């Protein structure tokens, strides 16, 4: 099965308690990854609650980075909001 979230729900997760963002229609919970991110936590908090796909691809993340990102997926963006 798969859990779907709306943009309205995702937008709420951008505080000190929770940080979610969207990448390629998938929802990632990066709350506990903030301090481990090689690119820093500031670049993640700025995109929190929205779609960061372009910025993610813009810096050109490596294969290892993409493989690791999969562990943070909690669902997908609801089809109606795509
Ligand atoms: C899905 C979560 C993400 C993971 C697992 C992740 C992981 C990493 C890793 C492992 C690196 C080191 C270089 C590499 O291996 O490519 C990196 C660098 C970087 N990341 Fe991310 N990243 C994520 C999301 C993002 C997002 C959404 C942004 C921007 C909006 C971002 C901005 C950067 C920046 C600025 C660097 C530095 C690149 C450089 O110095 O060339 N990352 N990230």
PDB file of C-alpha atoms and ligand atoms in Angstrom:
ATOM      1  CA  UNK A   1       0.000   0.000   0.000  1.00  0.00           C
ATOM      2  CA  UNK A   2       0.995   3.646  -0.243  1.00  0.00           C
ATOM      3  CA  UNK A   3       0.146   6.679   1.870  1.00  0.00           C
ATOM      4  CA  UNK A   4      -0.696   9.936   0.089  1.00  0.00           C
ATOM      5  CA  UNK A   5      -0.345  13.424   1.515  1.00  0.00           C
ATOM      6  CA  UNK A   6      -1.767  16.700   0.215  1.00  0.00           C
ATOM      7  CA  UNK A   7       0.235  19.897  -0.193  1.00  0.00           C
ATOM      8  CA  UNK A   8      -1.883  21.370   2.596  1.00  0.00           C
ATOM      9  CA  UNK A   9      -0.742  18.678   5.043  1.00  0.00           C
ATOM     10  CA  UNK A  10       2.924  18.779   4.027  1.00  0.00           C
ATOM     11  CA  UNK A  11       3.119  22.564   4.409  1.00  0.00           C
ATOM     12  CA  UNK A  12       2.528  22.161   8.157  1.00  0.00           C
ATOM     13  CA  UNK A  13       5.819  20.310   8.677  1.00  0.00           C
ATOM     14  CA  UNK A  14       8.293  23.174   8.739  1.00  0.00           C
ATOM     15  CA  UNK A  15       9.047  23.911  12.400  1.00  0.00           C
ATOM     16  CA  UNK A  16      11.672  22.847  14.949  1.00  0.00           C
ATOM     17  CA  UNK A  17       9.749  19.621  15.524  1.00  0.00           C
ATOM     18  CA  UNK A  18       9.290  18.346  11.985  1.00  0.00           C
ATOM     19  CA  UNK A  19      10.812  18.997   8.561  1.00  0.00           C
ATOM     20  CA  UNK A  20       9.221  17.420   5.470  1.00  0.00           C
ATOM     21  CA  UNK A  21       9.840  18.222   1.816  1.00  0.00           C
ATOM     22  CA  UNK A  22       8.879  16.863  -1.577  1.00  0.00           C
ATOM     23  CA  UNK A  23      11.235  15.416  -4.188  1.00  0.00           C
ATOM     24  CA  UNK A  24       9.884  13.882  -7.404  1.00  0.00           C
ATOM     25  CA  UNK A  25       6.355  13.442  -5.977  1.00  0.00           C
ATOM     26  CA  UNK A  26       7.658  11.575  -2.932  1.00  0.00           C
ATOM     27  CA  UNK A  27       7.434  12.902   0.625  1.00  0.00           C
ATOM     28  CA  UNK A  28      10.566  12.824   2.792  1.00  0.00           C
ATOM     29  CA  UNK A  29      10.759  13.291   6.555  1.00  0.00           C
ATOM     30  CA  UNK A  30      14.220  14.825   7.074  1.00  0.00           C
ATOM     31  CA  UNK A  31      13.756  15.833  10.705  1.00  0.00           C
ATOM     32  CA  UNK A  32      16.599  13.616  11.997  1.00  0.00           C
ATOM     33  CA  UNK A  33      18.829  14.096   8.952  1.00  0.00           C
ATOM     34  CA  UNK A  34      19.176  17.872   9.296  1.00  0.00           C
ATOM     35  CA  UNK A  35      22.418  17.804  11.291  1.00  0.00           C
ATOM     36  CA  UNK A  36      23.940  14.979   9.237  1.00  0.00           C
ATOM     37  CA  UNK A  37      23.361  16.543   5.814  1.00  0.00           C
ATOM     38  CA  UNK A  38      26.742  17.326   4.160  1.00  0.00           C
ATOM     39  CA  UNK A  39      25.194  20.370   2.514  1.00  0.00           C
ATOM     40  CA  UNK A  40      24.081  21.760   5.859  1.00  0.00           C
ATOM     41  CA  UNK A  41      20.698  22.045   7.537  1.00  0.00           C
ATOM     42  CA  UNK A  42      19.958  25.620   6.423  1.00  0.00           C
ATOM     43  CA  UNK A  43      19.422  24.564   2.801  1.00  0.00           C
ATOM     44  CA  UNK A  44      16.917  21.953   3.984  1.00  0.00           C
ATOM     45  CA  UNK A  45      14.921  24.162   6.364  1.00  0.00           C
ATOM     46  CA  UNK A  46      14.505  26.781   3.632  1.00  0.00           C
ATOM     47  CA  UNK A  47      12.756  24.234   1.405  1.00  0.00           C
ATOM     48  CA  UNK A  48      10.788  22.605   4.240  1.00  0.00           C
ATOM     49  CA  UNK A  49       7.088  22.095   3.578  1.00  0.00           C
ATOM     50  CA  UNK A  50       7.347  22.350  -0.187  1.00  0.00           C
ATOM     51  CA  UNK A  51       8.741  20.900  -3.393  1.00  0.00           C
ATOM     52  CA  UNK A  52      12.555  21.033  -3.538  1.00  0.00           C
ATOM     53  CA  UNK A  53      13.038  18.837  -6.604  1.00  0.00           C
ATOM     54  CA  UNK A  54      14.677  21.487  -8.803  1.00  0.00           C
ATOM     55  CA  UNK A  55      17.137  22.635  -6.130  1.00  0.00           C
ATOM     56  CA  UNK A  56      17.974  19.000  -5.361  1.00  0.00           C
ATOM     57  CA  UNK A  57      18.766  18.229  -9.001  1.00  0.00           C
ATOM     58  CA  UNK A  58      20.457  21.610  -9.450  1.00  0.00           C
ATOM     59  CA  UNK A  59      23.317  20.689  -7.102  1.00  0.00           C
ATOM     60  CA  UNK A  60      23.463  17.283  -8.780  1.00  0.00           C
ATOM     61  CA  UNK A  61      23.420  14.818  -5.889  1.00  0.00           C
ATOM     62  CA  UNK A  62      25.455  11.633  -6.265  1.00  0.00           C
ATOM     63  CA  UNK A  63      24.191   8.072  -6.612  1.00  0.00           C
ATOM     64  CA  UNK A  64      25.016   7.342  -2.960  1.00  0.00           C
ATOM     65  CA  UNK A  65      23.065  10.407  -1.837  1.00  0.00           C
ATOM     66  CA  UNK A  66      20.020   9.294  -3.823  1.00  0.00           C
ATOM     67  CA  UNK A  67      20.202   5.737  -2.501  1.00  0.00           C
ATOM     68  CA  UNK A  68      20.332   7.047   1.070  1.00  0.00           C
ATOM     69  CA  UNK A  69      17.403   9.423   0.530  1.00  0.00           C
ATOM     70  CA  UNK A  70      15.072   6.460   0.024  1.00  0.00           C
ATOM     71  CA  UNK A  71      15.263   5.623   3.728  1.00  0.00           C
ATOM     72  CA  UNK A  72      13.468   8.892   4.549  1.00  0.00           C
ATOM     73  CA  UNK A  73      10.423   8.382   2.309  1.00  0.00           C
ATOM     74  CA  UNK A  74       7.119   8.364   4.228  1.00  0.00           C
ATOM     75  CA  UNK A  75       4.702   8.605   1.315  1.00  0.00           C
ATOM     76  CA  UNK A  76       3.772  10.324  -1.928  1.00  0.00           C
ATOM     77  CA  UNK A  77       2.041  13.507  -3.032  1.00  0.00           C
ATOM     78  CA  UNK A  78      -1.689  13.012  -3.559  1.00  0.00           C
ATOM     79  CA  UNK A  79      -2.460  12.646  -7.312  1.00  0.00           C
ATOM     80  CA  UNK A  80      -4.957  15.519  -7.177  1.00  0.00           C
ATOM     81  CA  UNK A  81      -2.204  17.950  -6.158  1.00  0.00           C
ATOM     82  CA  UNK A  82       0.179  16.908  -8.963  1.00  0.00           C
TER      83      UNK A  82
HETATM   84  C1  LIG B   1      16.643  13.642   0.338  1.00  0.00           C
HETATM   85  C2  LIG B   1      17.626  14.141   1.196  1.00  0.00           C
HETATM   86  C3  LIG B   1      18.926  14.479   0.818  1.00  0.00           C
HETATM   87  C4  LIG B   1      19.999  13.686   0.970  1.00  0.00           C
HETATM   88  C5  LIG B   1      19.980  12.212   1.376  1.00  0.00           C
HETATM   89  C6  LIG B   1      21.167  14.500   0.716  1.00  0.00           C
HETATM   90  C7  LIG B   1      22.480  14.034   0.803  1.00  0.00           C
HETATM   91  C8  LIG B   1      23.593  14.783   0.442  1.00  0.00           C
HETATM   92  C9  LIG B   1      24.924  14.227   0.350  1.00  0.00           C
HETATM   93  C10 LIG B   1      25.278  12.780   0.686  1.00  0.00           C
HETATM   94  C11 LIG B   1      25.738  15.214  -0.108  1.00  0.00           C
HETATM   95  C12 LIG B   1      27.205  15.066  -0.498  1.00  0.00           C
HETATM   96  C13 LIG B   1      27.447  15.054  -2.005  1.00  0.00           C
HETATM   97  C14 LIG B   1      26.725  13.918  -2.704  1.00  0.00           C
HETATM   98  O1  LIG B   1      26.889  12.758  -2.275  1.00  0.00           O
HETATM   99  O2  LIG B   1      25.995  14.180  -3.684  1.00  0.00           O
HETATM  100  C15 LIG B   1      24.898  16.400  -0.257  1.00  0.00           C
HETATM  101  C16 LIG B   1      25.364  17.664  -0.614  1.00  0.00           C
HETATM  102  C17 LIG B   1      24.557  18.792  -0.793  1.00  0.00           C
HETATM  103  N1  LIG B   1      23.164  18.801  -0.691  1.00  0.00           N
HETATM  104 FE1  LIG B   1      21.990  17.280  -0.196  1.00  0.00          FE
HETATM  105  N2  LIG B   1      20.812  15.771   0.328  1.00  0.00           N
HETATM  106  C18 LIG B   1      19.424  15.754   0.377  1.00  0.00           C
HETATM  107  C19 LIG B   1      18.620  16.825   0.042  1.00  0.00           C
HETATM  108  C20 LIG B   1      19.080  18.067  -0.363  1.00  0.00           C
HETATM  109  C21 LIG B   1      18.198  19.160  -0.762  1.00  0.00           C
HETATM  110  C22 LIG B   1      16.675  19.081  -0.864  1.00  0.00           C
HETATM  111  C23 LIG B   1      18.987  20.251  -1.010  1.00  0.00           C
HETATM  112  C24 LIG B   1      18.632  21.531  -1.445  1.00  0.00           C
HETATM  113  C25 LIG B   1      17.359  22.129  -1.469  1.00  0.00           C
HETATM  114  C26 LIG B   1      20.367  19.806  -0.774  1.00  0.00           C
HETATM  115  C27 LIG B   1      21.498  20.607  -0.977  1.00  0.00           C
HETATM  116  C28 LIG B   1      22.814  20.134  -0.914  1.00  0.00           C
HETATM  117  C29 LIG B   1      23.998  20.956  -1.048  1.00  0.00           C
HETATM  118  C30 LIG B   1      24.051  22.465  -1.164  1.00  0.00           C
HETATM  119  C31 LIG B   1      25.066  20.138  -1.020  1.00  0.00           C
HETATM  120  C32 LIG B   1      26.512  20.553  -1.305  1.00  0.00           C
HETATM  121  C33 LIG B   1      26.869  20.188  -2.736  1.00  0.00           C
HETATM  122  C34 LIG B   1      28.302  20.538  -3.092  1.00  0.00           C
HETATM  123  O3  LIG B   1      29.036  21.023  -2.207  1.00  0.00           O
HETATM  124  O4  LIG B   1      28.689  20.333  -4.261  1.00  0.00           O
HETATM  125  N3  LIG B   1      20.412  18.448  -0.428  1.00  0.00           N
HETATM  126  N4  LIG B   1      23.566  16.103   0.032  1.00  0.00           N
END
